[PDB]
């Protein structure tokens, strides 16, 4: 932690006097002190870094995006001074990149990370941070290149292994991803004890038919990442009643359920008219959840936002649902038609959050061949009837009928969420 | 990408500061 250059050593008493104000929680006094030092010693890297750290603390205290933007600029100013110690330069830009990601400036974060790697090309850990940068904007191709270079220099870096494995799995290279995820988690390196990697390791093992999969679910549950071996969502509010199957009465949404069941044929008829006359509005499932088959969805609400063009194709259904904010305001759910054809098998999986319950209304249900398992219980749909399950539990679907199967999916807020939580939880 | 039915993205939420 060598932070002082030749000059900063001669003014260390003034620098320490300012930092002491910051460590003693006197943030506003600290900012003014470091501002004065910056004004008096405009080339001091330690003074400039002190100003940035005080601005950083001030933004936390005030919860101000505008103050944090100021800190992010001051962190950069440190890097442009002459004679900056390498440790100070690294610390300053790293914090800058971190704070850019916090604000959602992912492109800015990436440029900072590319500068850090150009300045310190032998620093493996900075390359790992850059790979994460790419993963956050969904750029799996560039993330993959970065971790390949890291695994070339240091083959047993456990952080690079799990992220490499995560990318392979996301690219549907299931069997290839398993040794990277497994060895990465077993390395115990910092950053590998993460629920995402246990989730995808157990799932890749389930898909290749490896019984060891449930060992990792149980280890993930023992390490605190999963509520149970069955319930493996990662964006959770703790304490919510956890139960695979729900009756209408237990949810308290009886008016919504009665409305769906009383009016189900109207919902069916608008779904069939879209199939027949606007089938381009049904989009294929795009989350790699199928082993095989054809499965498409026509989405009316997503993240609590009404899809206006979609509601032009199902206007009476959209009018009916407007009455029920417990589903239309569910920012962690959707409302959508779901069509599935014969020969379809949906892999076991869970949704991302325990904050919703998922209702299925049967619209066109073949007499045989269609079933849904949630946890250890298999059920089937009925036309005009609502089924309710918590899709944060492992569930699986088969379509082996002789014709198409159409249902209506309505997500509601978990009933035990308070209104404060419903309005403040980030959308998913 | 968004996490609708599954957990396939590296992150499912969006960061918007404070
Ligand atoms: O049966 C369907 O259309 C979808 C099944 C499923 O995985 C879900 O409802 O989350
Ligand atoms: Fe599902």
For residues A167 and A311, give the distance between their C-alpha atoms in angstroms, rounded to a whole number: 36
Q: Are strands A344-349 and A395-399 parallel, antiparallel or unpaired?
A: antiparallel
Q: At what angle do helices A124-136 and A106-119 cross, to 10 degrees?
A: 160
What is the per-residue burial (b if ≥16 Cβ within 10 Å, else e) of A387-425?
bbbbbbbbbbbbbebeeebbbbbbbbbbeebeeeebeeb
For residues A167, A171, A175, A181, the Cα torsion angle rounded to the nearest 10 degrees is 10
Q: A340, A371 in Cβ contact below 8 A? A: no
The pick from A291, A379, A397 for probing ligand 1's pocket by mutation, whose C-beta has the most ligand atoms within 8 angstroms, reads A397
CA A364 / ligand 2 centre spacing (Å):
19
Q: Quick check: CB of A358 below 6 Å from ligand 1?
A: yes
Separation between Cα atoms, residue A52 and residue A287, nearest integer Å:
42
Q: How far apart are CA A45 and CA A59, in angstroms?
A: 21
Q: Which of A68, A166, A287 sits opposite B5 (nearest CB)?
A: A287
Interatomic CA distance for residues A195 and A311, integer angstroms: 37
**SS3 sequence of chain B:** CCCCCCCCCCCCCCCCCC
Hey, is the C-beta of A287 within 8 angstroms of any chain B C-beta?
Answer: yes
Tokens of A118: 């150009």
Residues of A in contact with B6 (CB under 8 A): 287-289, 349-352
Whether the Cβ atoms of residue A72 and residue A99 lie closer than 8 Å to each other: yes
Determine how β-strand A334-340 pairs with β-strand A344-349: unpaired
| Cα–Cα dist A427/A235, whole Å | 10
Q: Tell whether domain A1-121 is in CATH 3.40.190.10.
A: no
3-state secondary structure A81-105: CCCCCHHHHHHHHHHHHHHHHHHCC
* Contact (CB, 8 A) for A181 and A166: yes
Tell me the ligand closest to A406's alpha carbon.
1
Closest to A75 (Cα-Cα) out of A117, A45, A103: A45
Residue A391 Cβ inside 6 Å of ligand 1? The answer reads: yes
Question: Where are chain A's structural domains?
Answer: 1-121, 131-226, 245-424
* Method used to determine the 3D structure: X-ray
The total of other beta-carbon atoms located within 10 Å of residue A222's CB is: 10
Closest ligand 1 atom number to CA of residue A297: 3
Q: C-alpha angle A232/A293/A138, rounded to 5°?
A: 50
Place of tokens 């460590």: A23
Superfamily of domain A131-226: Tetratricopeptide repeat domain (1.25.40.10)
Are A1-121 and A245-424 in the same CATH fold? no
Residue A307 has phi, psi (to 5 degrees) of -80, 105
Cα nearest neighbour of B5 on chain A:
A351
With 0-12 / 13-18 / 19 or more C-beta atoms within 10 angstroms meaning exposed / middle / buried, residue A199 is buried
A258-294 per-residue burial string, b: 16 or more CB within 10 A, e: under 16: ebbeeebeebbebbbebbeeeeebbeebeebbbeebe
How wide is the angle at C-alpha A103 spanned by C-alphas A33 and A124, nearest 5°? 90
Helix axes A174-187, A158-170, angle to 10 degrees: 160
Q: What is the 3-state secondary structure (H, E, C) of chain A?
A: CCCCCHHHHHCHHHHHHHHHHHHCCCHHHHHHHHHHHHHHCCCCHHHHHHHHHHHHHHHHHHCCHHHHHHHHHHHHHHHCCCCCCHHHHHHHHHHHHHHHHHHCCHHHHHHHHHHHHHHCCCCHHHHHHHHHHHHHCCCHHHHHHHHHHHHHHCCCCHHHHHHHHHHHHHCCCHHHHHHHHHHHHHHCCCCCCCHHHHHHHHHHHHHHCCCCHHHHHHHHHHCCCCCCCCECCCECCCCCCCCCEECHHHHCCHHHHHHHHHCHHHHHHHHHHHHHHCHHHCEECCCCCEEECCEEEEEEEECCEECHHHHHHCHHHHHHHCCCHHHHCCCCCEEEEEEECCCEEEEEECCCECCEEEEEEEEECCCCCEEEEECCEEECCCECCEEEECCCECEEEEECCCCCEEEEEEEEECCCCCHHHHHHCCCC
Which residue of chain A is at minimal alpha-carbon distance from B13? A428
CA–CA separation, A325 and A417 (whole Å): 14
CATH of A245-424, one of 1.10.390.10, 2.130.10.10, 2.60.120.330, 1.10.3720.10: 2.60.120.330
Cβ A65–B17 below 8 Å, yes or no?
yes
Q: How far is B10 from chain A (nearest CA, A)?
A: 6
Contacts of residue A29, defined as CB under 8 A and 6 or more positions apart, other chains included, come to A21
Task: Phi first, then psi: give them for residue A335, nearest 5 degrees.
Answer: -130, 120
A 10 A CB-CB count for A320 gives 17
B17 to chain A, minimum CA–CA distance in Å? 4
| Beta strand A290-292 pairing with A305-306 | unpaired
HSE, CB side, 13 Å, CA atoms: give it for residue A397: 25
Centre a 10 Å sphere on the Cβ of residue A356 and count the other Cβ atoms it contains.
24
Cα A316 to middle of ligand 2, angstroms: 26
Tell whether residue A340 is among the known ligand binding residues. no
Structure tokens at A365: 């249900």
Q: Is the dihedral of CA A158, A164, A170, A174 positive or negative?
A: negative
d(CA A171, CA A135): 13
For ligand 2, a single-atom ion, the residues with CB < 5 A are A 391; B 5
Measured CA to CA, the distance from residue A212 to residue A290 in angstroms comes to: 21
């Amino acid at each position: 932690p060598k932070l002082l250059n030749k000059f900063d050593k001669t003014i260390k008493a003034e620098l320490d006097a300012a930092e002491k104000l910051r460590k003693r929680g006197k943030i506003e006094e600290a900012v003014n002190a470091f501002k004065e030092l910056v004004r008096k010693y405009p080339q001091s890297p330690r003074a400039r870094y002190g100003k940035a750290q005080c601005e950083d603390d001030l933004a936390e205290k005030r919860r101000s995006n505008e103050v944090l933007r100021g800190a992010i600029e001051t962190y950069q100013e440190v890097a442009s001074l002459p004679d900056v110690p390498a440790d100070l330069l690294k610390l300053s830009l790293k914090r800058r990149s971190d704070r850019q990601q916090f604000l959602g400036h992912m492109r800015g974060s990436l440029l900072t990370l590319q500068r850090l790697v150009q300045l310190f090309p032998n620093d493996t850990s900075l390359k790992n941070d850059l790979g994460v940068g790419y993963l956050l904007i969904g750029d799996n191709d560039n993330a993959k290149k970065v971790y390949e270079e890291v695994l070339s220099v240091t083959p047993n870096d456990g952080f690079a292994k799990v992220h490499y494995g995560f990318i392979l799995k996301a690219q549907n290279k299931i069997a290839e991803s398993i040794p990277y995820l497994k060895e990465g988690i077993e390395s115990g390196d910092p950053g590998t004890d993460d629920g995402r990697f246990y989730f995808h390791l157990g799932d890749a093992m389930q898909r290749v038919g490896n019984k060891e999969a449930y060992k990792w679910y149980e280890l993930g549950h023992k390490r605190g990442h999963f509520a149970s071996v069955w319930q493996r969502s990662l964006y959770n509010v703790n304490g919510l009643k956890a139960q695979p199957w729900w009756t209408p009465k237990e949810t308290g949404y009886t008016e919504l359920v009665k409305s769906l069941e009383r009016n189900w044929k109207l919902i069916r008829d608008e779904g069939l008219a879209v199939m027949d006359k606007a089938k381009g509005l049904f989009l294929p499932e795009d989350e790699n959840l199928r082993e095989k088959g054809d499965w498409s969805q026509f989405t009316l609400w997503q993240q609590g936002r009404r899809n206006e063009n979609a509601c032009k194709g199902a206007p009476k259904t959209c009018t009916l649902l407007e009455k029920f904010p417990e589903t239309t305001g569910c920012r962690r759910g959707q409302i959508k038609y779901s069509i599935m054809h014969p020969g379809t098998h949906v892999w076991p999986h869970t949704g991302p959050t325990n904050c919703r319950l998922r209702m299925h209304l049967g619209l066109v249900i073949p007499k045989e061949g269609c079933k849904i398992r949630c946890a250890n219980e298999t059920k089937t749909w009925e036309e005009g009837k609502v089924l309710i399950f918590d899709d944060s539990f492992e569930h699986e679907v088969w379509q082996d009928a002789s014709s198409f199967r159409l249902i209506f999916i309505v997500d509601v807020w978990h009933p035990e969420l308070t209104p404060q939580q419903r309005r403040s939880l980030p959308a998913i | 990408g968004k996490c609708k039915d599954g957990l396939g993205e590296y992150t499912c939420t969006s960061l918007e500061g404070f």
